[PDB]
């Protein structure tokens, strides 16, 4: 019962090798190959298919299928047809063909072309070619790392869009900004603990907690500069980039770093609004020793340490923690930029309106004192008010601009990341389209924009530490040195 043979005139095998494997027969036909009418032409069409040498999971199941349709066995004026299971085994791994161009009519599993349950002479042939992937991709087995319809390989950990030198330059930029920001916030923490007995008043001690946030946030940024520490945070066990964390196949070094960075930076950002409110209500009672914040201290912490906690947990719940090779940390919204609109631009924008409101309102009250009471208090007192008004002015200008910078950088990624993703996809297609049978990336993110965006981040931490850059703090450390 030969449901698997069809009448055809056997021709002599002009090629005794199919995709790098020996053939146990010596007769073929172009009957099954509807796109070619000659062995030289069918062999040429196999060169085009050879581009699928990448993405091993499809190359392993399509090799037998091709050497059974283009170079099938012919004996006694009879050609052997491929089995239907041999054809079904290619629709899954090789779903990319249907996307890029579409399968040919003679390669679709049809009963007239691929009957169910037939012997295959190619099943006895050993194909040594396992499948090599281009430079940007890397071999991996876990399905959660495969590039879109490229089953068998994922994106290498080191960002393919930037070179080794561009990675080294960015790391030096972060090592420099991270160290100064870490040392500046530490200087604020030290001056507070050195005089904690008096500094622990809350209209001012809030600065201690803001610098504490940006300090811890800087620790997560500087963690990458350890031996083999960045590879543990950004990479996976197979050698591909991290994304969609948390998972169950990788470690926790990525989600750990993210919580240190996102929670600390968001906590310090909301501390800014609490500070502006504290300044706003303290100025209303200026001129007296009355404390309007006598019973609002605990309420401040219960609101500043819980908001960033709900936000962080929400990100972990939707699993949008990604890893970047250039920055050296794990953050939210790297892969899918939409999430960075609600978990970054939304909290930052809100603290700019409410925080900026109290900031402007607080200066108005400080400006009314100079006008409502002229000549009552002068000398040092008058200088302290103007110097504080100027200190709050340069501070709001600085925060307003850094938020403008962040919104500019985010809108830049919102507008071109889709195009960036196309560029890399087309770059992966040409590599197999030109070589087997030079490429260049069309568009990539701007490193300058990334630095400008980090400048607004690190700049905020250094701006928070400038509030203790006074002559009064210098005396605090001059006293501790004497007692030593």
């Amino acid at each position, epitope marked *: 019962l030969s449901h698997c043979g069809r009448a055809a005139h056997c021709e002599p095998l002009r090629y005794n090798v199919c995709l790098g494997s020996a053939l146990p027969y010596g007769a073929t036909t172009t009957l099954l190959a509807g796109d070619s009418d000659s062995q030289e032409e069918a062999h040429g069409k196999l060169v085009l298919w050879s581009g699928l040498r990448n993405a091993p999971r499809c190359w392993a199941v399509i090799q037998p299928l091709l050497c059974a349709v283009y170079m099938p066995k012919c004996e006694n004026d009879r050609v052997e047809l491929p089995s239907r299971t041999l054809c079904q085994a290619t629709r899954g791994p090789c779903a990319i063909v249907e996307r890029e161009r579409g399968w040919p009519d003679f390669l679709r599993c049809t009963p007239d072309h691929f009957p169910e349950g037939c012997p295959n002479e190619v099943q006895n042939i050993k194909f040594n070619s396992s499948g090599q992937c281009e430079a940007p991709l890397v071999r991996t087995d876990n399905p959660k790392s495969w590039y879109e319809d490229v089953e068998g390989c994922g994106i290498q950990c080191q960002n393919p869009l930037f070179t080794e030198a561009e990675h080294q330059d960015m790391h030096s930029y972060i090592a420099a900004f991270g160290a100064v920001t870490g040392l500046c916030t530490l200087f604020t923490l030290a001056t507070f603990v050195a005089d904690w007995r008096n500094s622990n008043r809350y209209p001012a001690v809030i600065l201690f907690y803001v610098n504490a946030c940006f300090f811890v946030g800087s620790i997560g940024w500087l963690a990458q500069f350890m031996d083999g520490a960045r590879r543990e945070i950004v990479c996976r066990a197979d050698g591909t980039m991290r994304f969609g964390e948390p998972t169950s196949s990788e470690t926790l070094s990525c989600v750990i770093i993210f919580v240190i960075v996102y929670y600390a930076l968001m906590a310090g950002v909301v501390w800014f609004v609490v500070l502006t409110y504290a300044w706003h209500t303290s100025f209303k009672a200026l*001129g007296t020793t*009355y404390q309007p914040l006598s019973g609002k201290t605990s309420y401040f912490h219960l609101l500043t340490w819980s908001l960033p906690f709900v936000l962080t947990v929400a990100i972990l719940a939707v699993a949008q923690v990604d890893g970047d090779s250039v920055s050296g940390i794990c953050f939210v919204g790297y892969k899918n930029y939409r999430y960075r609109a609600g978990f970054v631009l939304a909290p930052i924008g809100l603290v700019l309106i409410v925080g900026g409101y109290f900031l402007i309102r607080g200066v108005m009250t400080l400006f009314s004192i100079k006008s409502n009471h002229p000549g009552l208090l002068s000398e040092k*007192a008058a200088s302290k008010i103007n110097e504080t008004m100027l200190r709050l002015g340069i501070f709001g200008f600085l925060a307003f601009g850094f938020v403008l910078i962040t919104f500019s950088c985010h809108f830049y990624d919102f507008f071109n990341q889709a195009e960036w993703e196309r560029s890399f996809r087309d770059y992966v297609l040409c590599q197999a389209n030109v070589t087997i049978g030079d490429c260049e990336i069309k568009n990539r993110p701007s490193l300058l924009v990334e630095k400008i965006n980090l400048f607004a981040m690190f700049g905020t931490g250094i701006a928070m530490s400038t509030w203790v850059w006074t002559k009064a703090t210098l005396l605090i450390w001059r006293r501790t040195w004497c007692r030593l």
Partner: nanobody
């Protein structure tokens, strides 16, 4: 830097009146906000009253009504007129002279006095 010196404290009976004063050794009396505080031998420092630039004044809940605060800009002295004293008012009343922006910024300092005990007998 200014040094304060309170006076007028002493033992008194319930329902009586007392007048405490706070003299500040130093010409800088206006550029500093001042107020009265009290601390019992087993309690934290409690807020009493304060005086602003004009008629602005703040009092505690258990103090408002009975206490009265007034300043003498010329004599660099702040007064606290206590009336109808209750035994629960027994405490060492202190006098603080702090910078205007003392609460909001760590660079500023607050200067306190020695305090005077005021005991009320039932």
């Amino acid at each position: 830097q200014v040094q304060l010196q309170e006076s007028g404290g002493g033992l008194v009976q319930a329902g009586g009146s007392l007048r405490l004063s706070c003299a500040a050794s130093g010409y800088i009396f206006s550029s500093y906000a001042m107020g009265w505080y009290r601390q019992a031998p087993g309690k934290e420092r409690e807020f009493v009253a304060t005086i602003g630039w004009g008629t602005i004044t703040y009092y505690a809940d258990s103090v408002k009504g009975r206490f009265t605060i007034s300043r003498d800009n010329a004599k660099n002295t702040v007064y606290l007129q206590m009336n109808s004293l209750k035994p629960e008012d027994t405490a060492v009343y202190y006098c603080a002279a702090q910078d205007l922006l003392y609460y909001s910024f760590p660079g500023d300092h607050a200067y306190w006095g020695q305090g005077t005990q005021v005991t009320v007998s039932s």
